[PDB]
Amino acid sequence: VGSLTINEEREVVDFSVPFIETGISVMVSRSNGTVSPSAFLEPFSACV
Amino acid sequence: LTILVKKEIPRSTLDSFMQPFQSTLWLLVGLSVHVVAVMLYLLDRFSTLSSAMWFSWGVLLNSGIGEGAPRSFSARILGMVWAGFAMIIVASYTANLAAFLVLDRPEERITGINDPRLRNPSDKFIYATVKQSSV
Amino acid sequence: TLSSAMWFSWGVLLNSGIGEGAPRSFSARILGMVWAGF
Amino acid sequence: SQKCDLVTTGELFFRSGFGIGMRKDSPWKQQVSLSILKSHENGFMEDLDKTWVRYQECDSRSNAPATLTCENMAGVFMLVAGGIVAGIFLIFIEIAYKSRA
Amino acid sequence: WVRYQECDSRSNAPATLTCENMAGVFMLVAGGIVAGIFLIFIEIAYKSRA
Amino acid sequence: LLWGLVFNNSVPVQNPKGTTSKIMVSVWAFFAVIFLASYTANLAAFMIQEEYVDQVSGLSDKKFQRPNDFSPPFRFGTVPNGSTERNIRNNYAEMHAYMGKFNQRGVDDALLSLKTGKLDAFIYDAAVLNYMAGRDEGCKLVTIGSG
Amino acid sequence: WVMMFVMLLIVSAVAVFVFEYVTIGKAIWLLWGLVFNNSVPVQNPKGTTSKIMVSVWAFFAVIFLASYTANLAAFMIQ
Amino acid sequence: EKNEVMSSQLDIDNMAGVFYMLGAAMALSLITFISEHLFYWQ
């Protein structure tokens, strides 16, 4: 009843229907801020 | 019947005069004012050396000290770059001011009875009450 | 400069350097302080 | 993602999958589901995911909050021509005044 | 008995700007004016040379 | 001289006659102040209501192929004695090199290490990551890009 | 406000005293309206500590304009 | 859902719009001055 999935060699074991769904992820942390090089309306206002 | 919890600590202490980052950026650009004002003086020389910088200081601070009307057209184009950059600077600084003034507040306020830090408590969680009550 | 004195108030209202109406009375400079405030 | 102009509010009530239907006691269950794992263990499922549904066309919910390119300013673009064509007559008025005064 | 509100609500006035925080930029008026007297003495030394 | 007045220059301009000259200057000054106010009201409105994107999906290829390209401080995670180790080693673990130094038995030790920054990234099963992300220390965001 | 108003009176008294070398009432309002970006052609002084202290006051001028506008728009919200 | 980070520091990588090509147009102004010097030859 442990929280284990299968690979193709897990032929040996016989699962039931999967009750929950999960996947493979990575974990990172936060940054602080974003890039926006003062040019948002500069091609927009460049039309006027 | 509700939950008694404790007041947080605000986002006060508005000593943020350089927290919009100047201590490197304003220090970097103030020297390039002078080092491009001297070469622009040479540009109007080969076609008031200590005096030509005050015109760039005048256009940078919106202050009517004006004596450096350039007889070369190209240094007037450089002044157009100055009034563009200075208005970009003061606009971006005002946007960083008002944004840092009102952006958000992090909040860990509990919901009520249906919150998982209550129902599955940590070791740090004294959620006790009084004795001999209907609670 | 009766027709001309209004342009000084238009100059202070639009941040536009049209300036000819420096008031020799101090009190009208106080009224100009009310204009730049408003 | 594809056409445009609709949203969803999340809240996945069911959380289910898409199996393959066969008759019971078939000899084609085990090796077929083994190949399902094999198609998972190379990312080829994700390859067909790229080739079929990973095509975003319209914008997200995001709210860029606004944009200011060209369009709305036509209400204040008339300020440059609203009085300059009558200022010629204002020159004619001024030269009439200077012919009087 | 109980209709006596003393402290402020949650509301978030969002801010106020009365007197307090501006002391970090209140030093700009005196940070260089006391040395500008010596800058006058420097200028009258330069005019005594030039 | 009739250009810099949109930016409130210092710049003493040649004052013209009292004619349609100064009238059309005031006409342009209306568009000057209304463009300054509109651009500033847009600009501060871009500092708010802005989504902040991380780069974890491209580095799932790029830092896999090139872990040493930007910084040798790229301290990776692991699932030691895990089935996921073999499954990537069979498919997508050329970074089963460079990662033997990055072995941590005990998940909460790797948690507090990356919380002090002693790991860059930590690969794991999704569901335990999402649940402990919801139980993460307060409000430190530790998810993967877009989920 | 009245603090910087008497600072304007102080620097005008300095511009009277240390430039004993045009400042009776003109030194007040010409050096007052520059916080509000007036039109107002002021009497241009010598290149001395006069224009230095003008630029010093101009820093506080633009930083007060930005701070008041950032507060004011923040009172329209929340 | 990924609301907002909090920032007050100026992004120094957003300074690319500030050293957007000041010196390049200054070099074109130098070539403009050199072409003026050849127009003095004409």
Q: Extract the runs of DSSP E, i.e. beta strands, from F3-144.
A: 122-125
Residue G23 to residue G46: CA distance in whole angstroms:
13
Instruction: Answer whether C12 sits within 8 Å of G38, measured CB to CB.
Output: yes
Which residues are bridge partners to A26 per DSSP?
A: F123
Q: Element (H or E) spanning A24, and its range?
A: strand A24-27
Closest CA to G42 of G30, G24, G50, G34: G30
Of A7, A31, A41, the CB nearest to F42: A41
Q: Chain H: list its partners (3+ Cβ pairs within 8 Å).
A: A, B, F
If you compute the radius of gyration of chain E from its CA atoms, what whole number of angstroms results?
A: 25
Which residues on G lie below 8 Å from B96 (Cβ)? none
Q: Evaluate whether A27 touches F121 at the Cβ level (below 8 Å).
A: yes
> Is F10 in CB contact (< 8 Å) with chain B?
yes
Residue B73 to residue F14: CA distance in whole angstroms:
16
Closest CA to C21 of C35, C3, C5: C5
Q: Evaluate whether H5 touches A31 at the Cβ level (below 8 Å).
A: yes
Residue B65 to residue G54: CA distance in whole angstroms:
9
Residue F5 to residue F28: CA distance in whole angstroms:
9
Q: Evaluate whether B59 touches F9 at the Cβ level (below 8 Å).
A: yes
At G37, give phi and psi (nearest 5°).
55, 65
Residue F24 to residue F57: CA distance in whole angstroms:
55
How far does Cα E3 stand from its chain's mean position? 41
Closest approach of C3 to chain G, Cα-based (Å): 18
Q: Evaluate whether G49 touches E39 at the Cβ level (below 8 Å).
A: yes
Residue E8 to residue E20: CA distance in whole angstroms:
20
Residue H38 to residue E17: CA distance in whole angstroms:
60
Of G25, G36, G37, the CB nearest to C37: G36
Resolution for this model in angstroms, one decimal place?
4.4
Count how many Cα atoms sit within 13 Å of the Cα of residue B42 in the half-sphere of its side chain. 8
Closest approach of D69 to chain A, Cα-based (Å): 4
Going by beta carbons, is chain F in contact with chain H, meaning 3 or more pairs sit under 8 Å apart? yes
Q: B33 in helix, strand or coil?
A: helix
Residue H23 to residue D83: CA distance in whole angstroms:
41
> Is A18 in CB contact (< 8 Å) with chain D?
yes
Neighbours of C32 (CB within 10 A): 23
Q: List helix spans (H) across chain G.
A: 2-17, 26-29, 49-76
